[PDB]
Paper text:
Programmed formation of DNA double-strand breaks (DSBs) initiates the meiotic homologous recombination pathway. Several other proteins are essential for meiotic DSB formation, including three evolutionarily conserved proteins first identified in Saccharomyces cerevisiae (Mer2, Mei4, and Rec114).
Unexpectedly, the structure revealed that REC114 (15-150) forms a PH domain, with two perpendicular antiparallel β-sheets followed by a C-terminal helix. Several residues are disordered in loops between the β strands. In the crystal, the PH domain formed extensive crystallographic contacts with a symmetry-related molecule. When injected at lower concentrations, the protein eluted later and the molecular weight diminished (21 kD at 5 mg/ml). Several conserved positively charged residues in the two β sheets, β1 and β2, important for the interaction are not present in REC114.
Author numbering:
A (entry chain B), B (entry chain B): 13 to 30, 47 to 107, 115 to 149
Write the structure that this text describes.
């Protein structure tokens, strides 16, 4: 909303968990609540579903420990979690994703797949 | 949730608006959604109701332009908005308020009423 934050809505978020599941996958539901990726101008990164914070860390000095890769409208974050931007079409999601890459890339490099 | 943020729930938030209302008052409802005051470790301050950001600014260098006053379990913010912390009792609300004052006071001074 503000000029202090940028925000993008997500279709999905998945936490690498490593019985023993590999992923815990969160989706934007009417009940569950909507997924938002937030980047604050000081360089803080959050993912939130409604009001619970699923992810929260500084992007400052993340060159040292953080790896981001984009495949189309998804980002993978490693050192692990995975995010997919929403939209009514593949273009609209991709356009969301790219806008976010633009702010993310101010702090880290966003690589292409290996 | 994280170690990157502190969060407190609010009973009420009121925006000074100056037909011509003086205040717009937001409350924690089941429909409307719950009020959260968030302070991020880089010094960013937010109030949010569900996922809408009602307030968002930096506390860094706010000594120059920002005035905070505490009356019991409420804070008034001027240069204007007003916040009241929640709790099952007056003590619990006051205890919430004070915890927040403790992080706020790292950036600004929190005055007593005039």
């Amino acid at each position: 909303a503000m000029g202090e934050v940028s925000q993008w809505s997500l279709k999905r978020y998945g936490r690498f968990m490593l019985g023993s599941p590999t992923w815990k996958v969160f989706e934007s539901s009417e009940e569950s609540g909507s997924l938002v990726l937030t980047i604050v101008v000081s360089g803080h990164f959050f993912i939130s579903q409604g009001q619970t914070l699923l992810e929260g860390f500084s992007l400052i000095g993340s060159k040292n420990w953080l790896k981001i890769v984009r495949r189309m409208d998804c980002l993978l974050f490693g050192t692990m979690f995975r995010v997919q931007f929403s939209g009514e079409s593949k273009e609209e999601a991709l356009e969301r994703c790219c806008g976010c890459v633009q702010t993310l890339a101010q702090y880290v490099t966003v690589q292409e797949p290996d």
